[PDB]
Scaffold this motif. Sequence first.
Motif, mmCIF file in Angstrom:
data_model
loop_
_atom_site.group_PDB
_atom_site.id
_atom_site.type_symbol
_atom_site.label_atom_id
_atom_site.label_comp_id
_atom_site.label_asym_id
_atom_site.label_seq_id
_atom_site.Cartn_x
_atom_site.Cartn_y
_atom_site.Cartn_z
ATOM 1 N N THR A 8 0.828 -1.194 0.000
ATOM 2 C CA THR A 8 0.000 0.000 0.000
ATOM 3 C C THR A 8 0.870 1.256 0.000
ATOM 4 O O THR A 8 2.084 1.209 0.221
ATOM 5 C CB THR A 8 -0.935 0.005 1.208
ATOM 6 O OG1 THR A 8 -0.161 -0.011 2.415
ATOM 7 C CG2 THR A 8 -1.846 -1.213 1.182
ATOM 8 N N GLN A 9 0.229 2.398 -0.256
ATOM 9 C CA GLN A 9 0.946 3.667 -0.261
ATOM 10 C C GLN A 9 1.330 4.120 1.141
ATOM 11 O O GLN A 9 2.224 4.961 1.283
ATOM 12 C CB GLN A 9 0.104 4.745 -0.945
ATOM 13 C CG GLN A 9 -1.232 5.011 -0.272
ATOM 14 C CD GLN A 9 -2.035 6.086 -0.979
ATOM 15 O OE1 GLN A 9 -1.619 6.610 -2.013
ATOM 16 N NE2 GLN A 9 -3.194 6.421 -0.424
ATOM 17 N N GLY A 38 -6.458 -1.473 6.728
ATOM 18 C CA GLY A 38 -5.607 -1.296 5.573
ATOM 19 C C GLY A 38 -4.262 -0.659 5.846
ATOM 20 O O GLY A 38 -3.479 -0.486 4.903
ATOM 21 N N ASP A 39 -3.965 -0.306 7.094
ATOM 22 C CA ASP A 39 -2.689 0.312 7.445
ATOM 23 C C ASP A 39 -1.737 -0.790 7.895
ATOM 24 O O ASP A 39 -1.763 -1.217 9.052
ATOM 25 C CB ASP A 39 -2.879 1.366 8.530
ATOM 26 C CG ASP A 39 -1.627 2.190 8.771
ATOM 27 O OD1 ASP A 39 -0.648 2.028 8.011
ATOM 28 O OD2 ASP A 39 -1.621 2.999 9.721
#
Lengths: 126, 273, 366
Positions: A8-9, A38-39
Amino acid sequence: SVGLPNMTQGFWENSMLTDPGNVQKAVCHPTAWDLGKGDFRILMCTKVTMDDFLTAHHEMGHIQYDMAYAAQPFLLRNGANEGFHEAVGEIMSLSAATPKHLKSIGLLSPDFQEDNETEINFLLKQ
Amino acid sequence: QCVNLTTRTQLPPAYTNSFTRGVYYPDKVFRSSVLHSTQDLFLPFFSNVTWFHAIHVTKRFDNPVLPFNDGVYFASTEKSNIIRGWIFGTTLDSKTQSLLIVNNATNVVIKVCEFQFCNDPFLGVYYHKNNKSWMESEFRVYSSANNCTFEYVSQPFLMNFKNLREFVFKNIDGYFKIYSKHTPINLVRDLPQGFSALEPLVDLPIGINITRFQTLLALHRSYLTPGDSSSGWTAGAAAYYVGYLQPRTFLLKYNENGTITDAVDCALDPLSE
Amino acid sequence: TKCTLKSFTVEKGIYQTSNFRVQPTESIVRFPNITNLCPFGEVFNATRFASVYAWNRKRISNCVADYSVLYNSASFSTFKCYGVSPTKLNDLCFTNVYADSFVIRGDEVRQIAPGQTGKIADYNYKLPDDFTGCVIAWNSNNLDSKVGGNYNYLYRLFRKSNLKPFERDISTEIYQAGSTPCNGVEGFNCYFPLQSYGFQPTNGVGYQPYRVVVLSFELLHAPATVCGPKKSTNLVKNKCVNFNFNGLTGTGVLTESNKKFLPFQQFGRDIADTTDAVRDPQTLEILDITPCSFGGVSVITPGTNTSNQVAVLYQGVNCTEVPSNVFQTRAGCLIGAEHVNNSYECDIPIGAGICASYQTSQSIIA
Ligand SMILES: *[C@@H]1O[C@H](CO)[C@@H](O[C@@H]2O[C@H](CO)[C@@H](O)[C@H](O)[C@H]2NC(C)=O)[C@H](O)[C@H]1NC(C)=O
Ligand SMILES: *[C@@H]1O[C@H](CO)[C@@H](O[C@@H]2O[C@H](CO)[C@@H](O)[C@H](O)[C@H]2NC(C)=O)[C@H](O)[C@H]1NC(C)=O
Ligand SMILES: *[C@@H]1O[C@H](CO)[C@@H](O[C@@H]2O[C@H](CO)[C@@H](O)[C@H](O)[C@H]2NC(C)=O)[C@H](O)[C@H]1NC(C)=O
Ligand SMILES: *[C@@H]1O[C@H](CO)[C@@H](O)[C@H](O)[C@H]1NC(C)=O
Ligand SMILES: *[C@@H]1O[C@H](CO)[C@@H](O)[C@H](O)[C@H]1NC(C)=O
Ligand SMILES: *[C@@H]1O[C@H](CO)[C@@H](O)[C@H](O)[C@H]1NC(C)=O
Ligand SMILES: *[C@@H]1O[C@H](CO)[C@@H](O)[C@H](O)[C@H]1NC(C)=O
Ligand SMILES: *[C@@H]1O[C@H](CO)[C@@H](O)[C@H](O)[C@H]1NC(C)=O
Ligand SMILES: *[C@@H]1O[C@H](CO)[C@@H](O)[C@H](O)[C@H]1NC(C)=O
Ligand SMILES: *[C@@H]1O[C@H](CO)[C@@H](O)[C@H](O)[C@H]1NC(C)=O
Ligand SMILES: *[C@@H]1O[C@H](CO)[C@@H](O)[C@H](O)[C@H]1NC(C)=O
């Protein structure tokens, strides 16, 4: 290249891949933190060391295993038992420990002997 | 918000012999000095046009709800801009949509909503002697506004019978075309005799059926009349006319510049035929 | 001439064979100016939006929508359309368009599609199966997210019934699953309908706030007041070119006129209902329409048994518009005949007092 998706970004902008040193206190203990939304980020003071390389591979395998079942409820975003969650991360490290992989990446030089003494030593160490 | 006007004497309506009026350009196509014949909905010449007069001496204020068959011919024989706007619709309630064209001397507001008008809607102004000028009093055309379709607000401005403003309204193919011709007059007669070619002003597509209409006039509530929530209102010298359109065939005489100078209704006399 | 008369021999005289005509060029098209497209300054570029259940229903019916600025833009993530081609959006017209605006989670954007189902697609916003429109969604995690987590957004999670297509309700009744009656608070089988959402800047793909808008297209019996931009090409005069102005089309050469039209009259006509004047919707100038030159081609030829040299006559066509001398007569342009000053007896009648003959090193003289 194995088949796992990309990161992920927020993984490359929130993870502390560099030990700050004496400027601030920070525990250097490799742990795959899963915030659940999502982190995904790794907390490890990775340095130039083969052991650190295998530990980073283990942490990335843990992150991939956590992201595998990310599309599940909160009560399901966890391993089946208390042994699979670490085995999935350790198998990647055990597979990446082969000298052929380090030679193909660029660490080990192409000119390298394939004697059985090193294999026996590695088997005994394992 | 509805206020019913009380203290009003009922008088029978009147009529007048309309001259050769109600001639408008049917299309936007230029033509030379050559003549042209068309079969558009026009106003028959020398037809009975209902006269609505509203003055104060008993006081008279007539503004009923008239039907809309195929088109109306509205005239403004005013001297101080008493007529404020018009109302168009079929039920004048929250049932269906209704066109509301009102001009509160500051903006030409044209909205297409489902207004629920009152029984006797109007506009009120106030006269203050200390200010030496006129001012608006209230706005009680409707009570609330439902979902709308179109809205328009003109640019802001300020505002014997020495003014005449004609209007012709139609409703075909959903479009609501409006024709107008503002011409100055100086006389004391009811309707002047002459000729005027009305030009198209707007063609706002309301897209709704219109079967009835009503004129919104202005009133005065100065210190001359006793103050009252429903009474004590007066109106100056003002009158308007209503003429219905019918399908006929005229012979338009276009000028070398494109302005209709004369016309003849080919239904009245054999000479016209 | 031999083929028109169906004979291998042609007698002395003038014969009509074909009809000359001029072809148009480049097909000039004209249209009025394009200003005040649509009030899009409050939907696609707004600052503060609403929840998924408080989606706005702004009507777009009295403005020319320009879909090219959004289709060719790279600031959007998804630009899928259903029931209509995304390219021909500016070519067709519409009647009324509903402008939706609501913020939803990143992974919930997929459920917003005609024919799809889900927890949010059935309890917060549902699209019909016959929906004809486009879906637009872009990333908004850089401005909608704040430090500490965003909790200003709510959504419906449980209700007794689903939502109909294009339905919006602000009812906040408590959900009762079991037979136990609810007095107004939660408990065993009593739950609250509204639930606060969460948006953090450190979240990955799928949880970021994505501002998704829905553009519904409807075409009912109302007049089409909303369309798209057009070509509006450049014009040229003194050339035969088929034109297409606002509301009509024709073929002919345009030129600078001198008439004074009325401010509301756009088209021009004359006796016998022939279009001869149109105004430029951009320059407000009047142009006189003239039909391009045309005339029956007459071939002046002597007897085939005498000679094979022929002459061509373009009736009523100027010599400068025809594309072995060239002589212009009042009857038209004559090509192939030498003009002489000697006056002989008329042998082959051409017209306007000019006649042709086969005299003396040997050709046809007019
Ligand atoms: C003005 O007059 C109208 C006409 O009577 C009134 O409208 C009536 O209102 C009553 C309310 O009790 C209804 O029962 C009637 O059916 C209405 N009649 C019509 C024809 O609509 C109106 O209320 C009056 N307004 C004022 C302020 O007195
Ligand atoms: C309305 O939305 C448009 C998006 O198309 C905005 O245009 C952008 O404006 C910013 C800064 O003003 C520029 O950096 C972008 O390049 C523009 N995008 C374009 C031109 O495609 C416009 O600013 C918005 N209007 C308002 C009032 O917010
Ligand atoms: C419509 O056509 C063009 C489109 O921009 C514009 O034409 C201008 O017209 C004004 C006044 O006639 C001139 O001063 C300008 O030089 C014209 N060109 C430009 C680029 O502004 C204008 O928008 C419209 N023309 C009109 C109303 O005549
Ligand atoms: C107009 O109305 C009057 C009565 O007001 C009547 O005498 C006259 O015949 C009417 N004219 C027409 C043309 O109907
Ligand atoms: C006329 O009405 C419009 C619409 O309500 C309003 O904006 C305008 O200020 C009014 N003009 C007045 C009260 O002079
Ligand atoms: C009339 O004058 C008074 C006194 O200043 C003022 O309050 C009021 O607004 C004025 N009315 C107008 C200008 O219509
Ligand atoms: C406005 O609301 C009415 C209420 O029934 C509805 O019928 C109509 O479709 C809505 N829209 C318009 C443009 O009138
Ligand atoms: C007007 O009335 C006609 C006659 O029934 C109807 O067909 C038409 O739909 C109506 N117009 C509108 C806008 O509903
Ligand atoms: C028509 O136009 C001409 C030329 O501009 C002008 O002289 C004349 O006064 C205009 N009106 C009439 C009725 O001819
Ligand atoms: C042909 O064109 C020329 C060039 O302008 C002109 O002088 C001549 O009168 C034209 N003849 C006819 C018949 O149109
Ligand atoms: C015919 O007469 C004209 C006028 O003088 C002259 O220009 C031309 O040259 C003459 N042609 C011949 C063939 O003499």
